[PDB]
Amino acid sequence: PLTALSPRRFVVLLIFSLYSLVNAFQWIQYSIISNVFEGFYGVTLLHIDWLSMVYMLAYVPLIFPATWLLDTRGLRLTALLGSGLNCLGAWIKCGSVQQHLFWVTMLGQCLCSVAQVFILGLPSRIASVWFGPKEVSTACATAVLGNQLGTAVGFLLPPVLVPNTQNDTNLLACNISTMFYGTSAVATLLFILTAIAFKEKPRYPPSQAQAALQDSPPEEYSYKKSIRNLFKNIPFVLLLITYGIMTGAFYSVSTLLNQMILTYYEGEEVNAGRIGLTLVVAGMVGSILCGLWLDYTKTYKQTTLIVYILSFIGMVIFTFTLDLRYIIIVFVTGGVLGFFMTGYLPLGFEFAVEITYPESEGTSSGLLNASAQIFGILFTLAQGKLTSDYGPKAGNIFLCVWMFIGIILTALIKSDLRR
């Protein structure tokens, strides 16, 4: 069949990244300056942590229905839903700048959480539908890097945008309103652009494989049967548990980073955001390097196990070096830990995909993400309680123990797959 590539693809991809990026920002805007918000709303730190945990909670039940909707109705509807939900949540947050309106901010965060479900699955679908065979991998990498950059910007900007001024409540409200209004304006512009230019599919197929897929009639897929078959594979279950543990540890560290840093470094919220951004950027670099290393070696289990062990070592180093009262040490430790942790994620994801080659990639991706969300919620709750009661060291040691368990599980995995 005739195959052509149009410039619109890039626009589409760009737009997606942007309205993915903002979403990631909204995930971590509250946590990085949680203490300040704790002062503004007169709530507990658990209230602020739930603003991060709602993203994880919403994904698990709605992912599979969201995947079914994406398959049945196409990419355009999913993109529109995600962008509109993000914009509406941003506006609701804009309407929540008051000491007695924490529930409005929670509603906005819930809307953004529902939006996230419609965004995480779009990268590969867009890359296939709009990009040629050579550019699929690069398009997907850019799409995911958009969300990761959004997380980094959420780590960095809010500390600067909203200085901690409990003495002056009006100034704090003004800064919070400014941040919310900026996010809302960006989200609204991105939603308008998605509506205007986010077409369902290109005029001509981008590749022969996509041409065959579009030409081929749709086929019914049993998500429940696929999940049951996937759970039958013990190696897949072990890899799911390990990936969930790693991603949940990352989420817990991100959510509670401000609480950990403020314990020993008071008045360093900006430095905490810088540490988070360094962690995320080192994670991006480590992900790229690990992808290249896996491509060159063609080894999955060995590379994944080495990366897991290095992540555990970095976690231990960060755990037992936070109290030295040297901010630069925290910077370096967080950079190394993010490098290794984020490098693990693509390796484990690709290992899961190849282990379950007969099964659909979408179902395995949904299972991996749901395990990540569940482990993130559990780790966030446990580590927050440990930090509140016994101090950050207890929660960090808890994370290290879970990482050791994950290392054991990864070692136990049996796989002859090579690639």
Place of tokens 């809010």: 158
Closest CA to 333 of 407, 285, 278: 278
Query: Going residue by residue from 206 to 245, which x/- string records binding to ligand Y01, judged by CB under 6 A?
Result: -----------------xx--x------------x---x-
Q: Which of 151, 304, 342, 371 binds ligand Y01 (CB under 6 A)?
A: 371
Least distance in angstroms from the C-beta of 57 to ligand CHT: 9
Distance CA 319, CA 255 (A): 16
Residue 311 within binding range of ligand CHT, rule CB under 6 A: no
Window 146 to 185, contacts with ligand CHT (CB under 6 A): 147, 151
Gaps after residue numbers in the chain (C–N over 2.5 angstroms): none
Nearer to ligand CHT, 55 or 236 (CB): 55
Residue in the structure block whose two tokens are 């780790």? 379
Q: Write the binding mask 308 to 347 for ligand Y01: x where contact by CB under 6 A, - elsewhere.
A: ----------------------------------------
To ligand CHT, the closest distance from the beta carbon of 125 in angstroms equals: 17
Please check whether residue 398 is in contact with residue 382, taking contact to mean a CB–CB distance below 8 angstroms.
Answer: yes
Q: Is the Cβ–Cβ distance between 337 and 214 less than 8 Å?
A: no
- Token pair in block for residue 69: 């909707």
Q: Residue 416 burial (CB < 10 Å; 0-12/13-18/19+)? A: exposed
In the block, which residue shows the tokens 């967080």? Answer: 334
Q: Pick from 24, 88, 110, 403 the residue near ligand CHT by CB under 6 A.
A: 24
Give the residue with the Cβ less far from ligand Y01, 110 or 253. 110
Q: Considering only residues 130, 251, 308, 398, which one is a binding residue for ligand CHT as defined by CB under 6 A?
A: 251
Question: Amino acid letter at 251?
Answer: Y
Other beta carbons within 10 angstroms of residue 228's beta carbon come to 10
- Residue 160 interacts with ligand Y01 (CB under 6 A): yes or no: no
Give the span between the Cα atoms of 351 and 207, in whole angstroms. Answer: 25
Selected from 12, 32, 54, 144, the binder of ligand Y01 by CB under 6 A is 54
Q: By rule CB under 6 A, what count of residues binds ligand Y01?
A: 27
Chosen from ligand Y01, ligand CHT, none, partner binding at 270 (C-beta under 5 to 8 Å by type): none
Q: Are the CB atoms for 85 and 69 separated by under 8 Å?
A: no
By the rule CB under 6 A, 408 interacts with ligand Y01: no
* Calpha distance 151→168 (Å, rounded): 29
Has 166 been labeled as part of a binding site? Answer: no
Say how far apart CA 271 and CA 327 lie, in whole Å: 8
Q: Does 55 bind ligand CHT (CB under 6 A)?
A: yes
In whole angstroms, the minimum distance from the beta carbon of 138 to ligand Y01 comes to: 31
Residue 345 in contact with ligand CHT, rule: CB under 6 A:
no
Would the annotation count 373 as a binding residue?
Answer: yes
- List the binding residues: 116, 373
